[PDB]
Write an enzyme that holds these catalytic residues in place. Sequence first.
Site: not given
Ligand SMILES: [Zn+2]
Ligand SMILES: [Zn+2]
Length: 586
Positions: A69, A208, A217, A237, A259, A261, A284, A377
């Site tokens: 991204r 991507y 997103k 989120h 991210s 975490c 997510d 991914r």
């Molecule tokens: Zn992430």
């Molecule tokens: Zn996420």
Amino acid sequence: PTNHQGLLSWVEEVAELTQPDRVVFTDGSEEEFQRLCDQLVEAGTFIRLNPEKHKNSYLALSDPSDVARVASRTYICSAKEIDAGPTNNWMDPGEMRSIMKDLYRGCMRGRTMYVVPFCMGPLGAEDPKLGVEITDSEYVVVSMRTMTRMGKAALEKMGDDGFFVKALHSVGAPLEPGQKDVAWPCSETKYITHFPETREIWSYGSGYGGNALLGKKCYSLRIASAMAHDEGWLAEHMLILKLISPENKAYYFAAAFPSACGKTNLAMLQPTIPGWRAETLGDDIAWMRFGKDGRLYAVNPEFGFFGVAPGTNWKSNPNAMRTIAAGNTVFTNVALTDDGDVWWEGLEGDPQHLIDWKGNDWYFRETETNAAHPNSRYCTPMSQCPILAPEWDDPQGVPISGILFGGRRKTTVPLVTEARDWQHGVFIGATLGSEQTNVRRDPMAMLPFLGYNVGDYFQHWINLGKHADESKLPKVFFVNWFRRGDDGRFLWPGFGENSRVLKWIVDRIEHKAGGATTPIGTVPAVEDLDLDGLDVDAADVAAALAVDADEWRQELPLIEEWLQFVGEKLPTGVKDEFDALKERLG
Ligand SMILES: [Zn+2]
Ligand SMILES: [Zn+2]
């Protein structure tokens, strides 16, 4: 060539502009999925993985210029710049349309244009949120089939004049007749543009992840946050966790982390204390709306997992590994083993030789480059998850008892804190801090994903709580699994042991646990936590839970500089909470 005249008119207008070789409306069927996969294998975009180890699974390797991204190329094109605000990149929408319409002209020459109907959230719903992604990427189509409820059912839901989000995408790599394509087409020129008023998404140049899978997103958070703003709900989120206690009562939590975490580990928690069980409804995105009873109900608008592979392993997240093990997965930029399995940094196995994400030989304890791309991914159906909650596909959603915010902080922020009330809870989300190379503010983990002004978003959170039945609102908590001692030790062992913190959270919701009233909220003492069976130093847990006034006084100017950055739309209610914290610290 079906429709729904509005959809058909749009498809014709787009095709007239982009000039594809043909147009295909996708139905989401298994027949279609295998046909598209065959074509991707033929194009070199996919190789088929060993079906004994992952049934119906594929590996795609991307152009090295297109591996993530791209925030700097992502835009919110509201009519006025203020309605994009300081956390967003803005451009006048007329200017943007002029640029992008030029890019789209003839951009699909030599390619099939796919028209991909989809539904965000369970189909069973009354007014579900629908979308159609037009794309010239077969990779996008296959991944959208996993990530959304795609095809026939969604198109039927649109009826003859139903509203849908128009989502346009091209890889920006037109072909001449007979020209040999590459495995992963893309462009050096990229835009991922959102028109909030009209609920439209225009993407160009990347194939991507969040740039191209427009449900992930762009719809789930950016467009949906704008819809939620206007319609009185929340698009967030957040993972959705179901925790079941020894009395066999279920509790649902929505939790937002930036991210790095360990969010996925928590989403698929294996509790370490007897009688406690955990199940997932998502890791997510959560969409939350008030029900008739005044409680907040969450639904996962997605249909699949799109997880960062590196770091995922059997020892820390066996539930994710088990989900992936069942196959039907598209992997992007991971490494290929000699027996047609996959590998990535962090995974068990110590493979002696691999083919890396660039197609080159890699050797154990020798090759100095990562075998998998660090942002590689897996894309896998949710329905395969062995700890999927039975409620996962219920269009009514699940009632949320607690909202958690979390970040990674070496110092200052204790292991867990409960908010004093909803407005304080909003302040806690709004000022969420997490370590960067020192502290990045990532409000509600939405910094790169808001569809409108961040201050107005905070006001929206404030308004929903003000107008609600206060006793029905989720309680708000902040968690920090990552606090460190002066010598760098981790004060809390984390992972499955986080279930002990979650037990305190459940007990607080039921008024069955106590804690200290500190200047930052309610924070348990060591004796308020269940540490039975856990070999941990009580002094370390005490340190994890400490609230040091000098440390928090140093935190204040960091928070104030963030609140100033939020700008003219910063809610008075958020400033109130800053002032109250400062007063309590003295
Ligand atoms: Zn992430
Ligand atoms: Zn996420």
